[PDB]
Amino acid sequence: MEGFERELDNIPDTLPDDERLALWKGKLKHYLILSSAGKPIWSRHGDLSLVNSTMGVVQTIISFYEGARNPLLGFTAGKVRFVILIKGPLYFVAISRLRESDAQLRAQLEALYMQILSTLTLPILTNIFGPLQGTESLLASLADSFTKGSPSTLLSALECLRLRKSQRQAITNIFLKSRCEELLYGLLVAGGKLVSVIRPRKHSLHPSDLQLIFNMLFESGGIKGNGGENWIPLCLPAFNNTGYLYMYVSFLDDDDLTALILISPSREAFYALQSMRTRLVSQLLSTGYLSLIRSTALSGRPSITSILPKTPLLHFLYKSRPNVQWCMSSLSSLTPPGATATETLLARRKLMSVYEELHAALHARHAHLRVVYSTADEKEGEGLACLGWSTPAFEVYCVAPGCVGRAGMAREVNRVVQWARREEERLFILGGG
C-alpha cells in the first residue's frame, strides 16, 4: 500500500537479527516451502535461518490437524491472510497482506508447485522427500512478479502481440514447413507474448502446459539470464511420470528480444533442433517478419485513446474462457510526465490492486456474480473508481476516472467487448498447425 516501493528489495543481511526479523515481519507478501517433516525448504523474502524459528508454529499447527485427519486449508487474521496448499510431501504456504482472496493464492502457489514438478518428475518428486539446486533463482524471481501484480498468472492465461491473421498464419506456415520428426510441440515468443504454436496430430498442447514454459523463461528467469543458446530438460503435467522432456531455447536476434522455443522427447535431438533454428533465421530475415516482430513488440500495449477515441477509461483488460488467452491496453498512460521508476511501479501495483478485489468478487463460492461495480474514492487525491463485468464465455475488466456511474461504463464496456471481438483474430490464437 504505502511501503511497497521499498518492499521489493531483499533483506540487507548486514544488521542484527532482531530488527532483521522485523523487516521480514511486516513485508507485504510471503511465499514459503516446507516439507512434510516441517523443515522449511525455500523462503523467498527470508533466509532459511529466519523462517525456521518462526515457521515451526505452522508445522506444529498442521501436525495436530494432520493427526486429526484434517489437512488444514487456510487462516485469516485482519488484513493478512494465510493460505496452505497440499501437494505431495511438500507443503505450500503463502502469507499475503494485500486484499487477495484464498483462490488467488491457490493459483499463485499452484504455479510455484508446477515449477518444482517441471524440473523433477513426479516419480522422483515424492521419493526425494538442496533438493532445488537450480530453481532457487527461478522461484525467487517468479515471486517478484506475483508481488508486482502478475496480470497473467492471476488471470491464468497468456498474452498476445498484435499481428494480423494473414501475417500470423504465414509465420505458422514457415514454422511448420521447417519441421523435423522430434517436435512434440514448439513455440515462438517475443517479449513474453506468444506468437505462434505448432502441434502434432495426436499429441495435444494442454493450456496448463504453456504456463510452465512462460513462467520459468519469460517472467521469472529472463531466459536464465540470457547466456545464448540453452538446452535444458523439462517435465510436463500432460506428459507426467516420464523422463525429462527436452526443450530448446535461444534468442532470435541478429522487450525487444525475441526467443524461440522448441521441444523434443529425445536427448540426441539438440543438433537437429540447433540446425532447425539456423534455417529458420535465414527464412525469417528473407521475408522480413523478424524485423516486423521487433517493431510490434517494442510498441506494445496500445494506447486506449487510440483504441477508442475520446474515452476516459484509464485501462483495459480482457479474457476469453474458450481458447484461453489474454489481452491488455496501455500501461504507461497513467502519467506521461512521470519517468522515475518509483511511480510507474506503484502505478502497476495499484492498478492490479484495483483488480485484485474484483477478481475475488467475481470468483466466489457458488455466488454467481456477473457484474461488479465499486468506487475507491480517495478522500483528497482523486475520484478513482473501478468497474467490472463478466460472462461464461469471456471476462472484461475496466477502470474509470472520477466521472463514474453505470452509464460511466456501460457506454463503453458494451463496445470494448466488440473491439476485442472485432480484433479477436489478431489478438487470440484459435489453434496451432
Partner: protein
C-alpha cells in the same frame, strides 16, 4: 444419506486463567459436543478430555502467531475441509471457539458449504448470544468472574449456553442480512410519529407512552413490538402465538425504541431478549410462565433481573405488541404487585386497538431496501427472510449469501452486483447511512 451440517464442538476459554500446567486444564470454561447436544435436543472418557484441552492449545498459538504480522490480534476464521472453525474475542481476553462441521455429503464421500452459515454473521451471532447472555448475568463477563467466582460461572454459563446451542441452527435460516448487523428491528411503521401538533398515524400514542414512564412508579423505559398479528378469531381459540418458528422481516420490528436511561448499546440487548420470548415461547432463560390470573400478562414481580447497570423486568403480552416494562431495582414494592398489575392492564388497555392500526401504517419490478444507522443502531429493514422448507427456499440461499458476502469486502463507497437469474444489489454509504438498494428482475 446426506448428513446435515451439525455443529461440532464449541469452547469458551480464557487464556489468562491458567499460567501453569496444573491450571492450564481449567482454561476451558464451557465445552460442547454433538453427544452433549443430544440430551438437550430432545428437550426442545479420559482420552476424550485430552483432545479437548489439546485443540485449544493451537488457538492460543494461532493468535500469538498472527498477532505479530499484521497487529490484527485475532485469527477470526480457521478454514479446514471438515469443520469450519471461527474465533471471536468477546471482551478483552475471553474467546469463543466454534467448529461448524461441514455438510457431509457421502460421489462416495464429498463435502460442501453451499448452505452452511457463513462465518461473517456467526461473529455477529455469537456476539448476539454473548450480549444476550450478559443481559441475564452481570454487567460485563469479566466483572462477572470477579463476583461469582470461577466455579459459579461454569454452572451459569453451562445453563445458558447449552440452551442456546441446543437449537442454534448453523444454516442460512431467518434473515441473515439483518443478522450480520446488530441493529434494532423496526416494523413497517417503524418508529412512531414524533412530536405533538400533528395527527398522522401513531403520533399522539407516544405521549401516553412517554407519559406512562412518569405516572407509574419506578418505570425507566418500555419497548413494544408487533411480532404477532391481530387477535385471530378463527376456529382455534389460542393459535399458540408463542411457540416454534422464526421472526418475520418487515413485520416483527420493534417499535417505540425507548425514551431514555438506556444506552443504545444495551438497548439492543433488551430488544434481542424481547425477540426470544416470541421466537421461543415459554422456553427462554428464566423460563417465563404466563400468569393464569391475568392472561394478558407474563413474568411479574413476586429473582429474574436485567443488567443494564439492574432493572427488574415484567412482561405485558397482547397478541401483538409485546411490552417490556423495565422497572427499577427498589422503587416498585413487590408487596403491592397485584394492584399495579390491574392498573397496568387498565392503563395499557386503550393502547391495543388504536395502536394496532397505527403500526399498520407504511411509508425496477421489485425493490427491497435496508437502512442501518451507526449512532442510533436502528435497522429499517425490508429484505424478506428465507421461508421454511416471497421467493422459493432454494433461491434465497444464494441471495442472502451474496448480500453479506460483499459487506465483508467493504468493511462514496458504492458497490454493485448481479446474478444470472437477475438481481441488482447496491451498497451505498453517505450521518453515515448504509442503504442497500437490493433489486430483482
Amino acid at each position: 444419506g446426506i448428513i446435515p451440517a451439525q455443529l461440532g464442538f464449541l469452547a469458551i476459554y480464557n487464556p489468562a486463567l491458567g499460567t501453569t500446567d496444573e491450571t492450564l486444564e481449567d482454561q476451558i470454561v464451557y465445552y460442547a459436543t454433538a453427544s452433549t447436544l443430544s440430551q438437550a435436543r430432545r428437550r426442545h472418557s479420559k482420552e476424550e478430555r485430552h483432545e479437548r484441552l489439546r485443540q485449544i492449545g493451537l488457538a492460543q498459538g494461532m493468535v500469538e502467531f498472527a498477532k505479530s504480522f499484521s497487529d490484527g490480534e485475532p485469527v477470526d476464521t480457521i478454514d479446514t475441509e471438515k469443520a469450519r472453525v471461527i474465533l471471536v474475542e468477546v471482551e478483552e481476553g475471553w474467546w469463543i471457539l466454534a467448529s461448524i462441521d461441514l455438510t457431509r455429503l457421502p460421489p462416495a464421500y464429498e463435502y460442501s458449504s453451499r448452505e452452511v452459515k457463513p462465518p461473517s454473521l456467526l461473529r455477529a451471532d455469537l456476539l448476539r448470544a454473548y450480549d444476550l447472555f450478559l443481559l441475564h448475568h452481570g454487567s460485563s463477563l469479566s466483572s462477572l468472574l470477579a463476583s461469582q467466582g470461577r466455579a459459579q460461572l461454569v454452572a451459569s454459563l453451562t445453563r445458558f449456553w447449552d440452551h442456546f446451542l441446543a437449537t442454534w441452527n448453523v444454516l442460512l435460516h431467518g434473515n441473515p442480512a439483518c443478522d450480520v448487523f446488530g441493529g434494532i428491528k423496526l416494523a413497517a411503521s417503524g418508529e412512531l410519529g414524533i412530536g405533538v401538533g400533528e395527527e398522522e398515524r401513531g403520533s399522539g400514542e407516544r405521549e401516553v407512552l412517554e407519559g406512562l414512564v412518569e405516572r407509574v412508579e419506578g418505570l425507566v423505559d418500555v419497548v413494544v413490538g408487533r411480532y404477532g398479528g391481530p387477535p385471530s378469531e378463527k376456529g382455534p381459540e389460542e393459535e399458540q402465538w408463542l411457540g416454534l418458528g422464526g421472526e418475520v422481516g418487515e413485520e416483527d420490528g420493534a417499535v417505540f425504541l425507548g425514551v431514555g436511561a438506556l444506552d443504545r448499546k444495551s438497548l439492543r440487548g433488551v430488544v434481542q431478549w424481547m425477540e426470544e420470548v416470541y421466537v421461543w415461547g415459554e422456553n427462554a432463560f428464566g423460563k417465563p410462565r404466563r400468569d393464569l390470573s391475568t392472561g394478558h400478562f407474563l413474568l411479574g414481580l413476586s429473582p429474574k433481573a436485567i443488567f443494564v447497570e439492574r432493572l427488574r423486568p415484567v412482561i405485558y403480552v397482547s397478541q401483538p405488541f409485546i411490552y417490556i416494562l423495565l422497572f427499577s431495582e427498589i422503587t416498585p414494592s413487590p408487596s403491592t404487585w397485584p394492584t399495579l398489575a390491574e392498573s397496568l392492564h387498565a392503563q395499557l388497555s386503550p393502547l391495543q386497538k388504536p395502536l394496532l392500526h397505527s403500526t399498520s401504517y407504511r411509508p425496477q419490478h421489485q425493490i427491497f431496501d435496508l437502512v442501518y444507522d451507526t449512532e442510533t443502531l436502528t435497522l429499517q429493514s425490508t429484505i424478506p427472510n428465507i421461508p421454511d422448507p416471497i421467493w422459493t427456499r432454494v433461491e434465497a440461499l444464494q441471495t442472502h449469501a451474496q448480500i453479506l458476502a460483499i459487506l465483508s469486502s467493504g468493511r462514496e463507497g458504492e458497490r454493485t452486483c448481479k446474478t444470472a437469474r437477475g438481481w441488482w444489489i447496491v451498497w451505498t454509504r453517505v450521518c453515515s447511512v448504509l442503504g442497500h438498494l437490493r433489486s430483482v428482475s
